[PDB]
Write a protein that binds this ligand. Structure first.
Ligand code: 43U
Length: 127
């Protein structure tokens, strides 16, 4: 054991708002990545116990996953698009930090990240 508590997805102390960019992040970016054949290892927090990765949370100190992101978006947790984009970037970076180039999980992260970059390139101007 043990896993840390997951990242928070609600906090009434955190300022938040809905923006057209955050709506795009949910409706376009997250939906595209979520349906990909390679999304599955990124859809929930790493369970280091079940996966027998005892070093995971010694190495990765700012964990993030698309389950968390989806709930943050659905819960209007974010103040702006940059906060959400930073969560996706943390998710990808963590995978590259923990694993090694050529590992299947890294190939999968790379395929998701490429789609992410393609979709974030068309992030709308703030309304
Ligand atoms: C939720 O994570 C997984 C679920 C099932 C399985 Br099999 C592997 C992972 C996983 N494993 C590793 N080594 N690094 C990761 N980075 C993001 N996912 C992972």
């Amino acid at each position: 054991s043990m896993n840390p508590p997951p990242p928070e997805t609600s906090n009434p102390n955190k300022p938040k708002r809905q923006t057209n960019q955050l709506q795009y992040l949910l409706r376009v970016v997250l939906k595209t990545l979520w349906k990909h054949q390679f999304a599955w290892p990124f859809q929930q927090p790493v369970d280091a116990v079940k996966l027998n990765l005892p070093d995971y949370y010694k190495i990765i100190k700012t964990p993030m996953d698309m389950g968390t992101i989806k709930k943050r978006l659905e819960n209007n947790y974010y103040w702006n698009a940059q906060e959400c984009i930073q969560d996706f970037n943390t998710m990808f970076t963590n995978c590259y930090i923990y694993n090694k180039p050529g590992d299947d999980i890294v190939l999968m992260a790379e395929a998701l990240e490429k789609l992410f970059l393609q979709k974030i390139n068309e992030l709308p101007t703030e309304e």
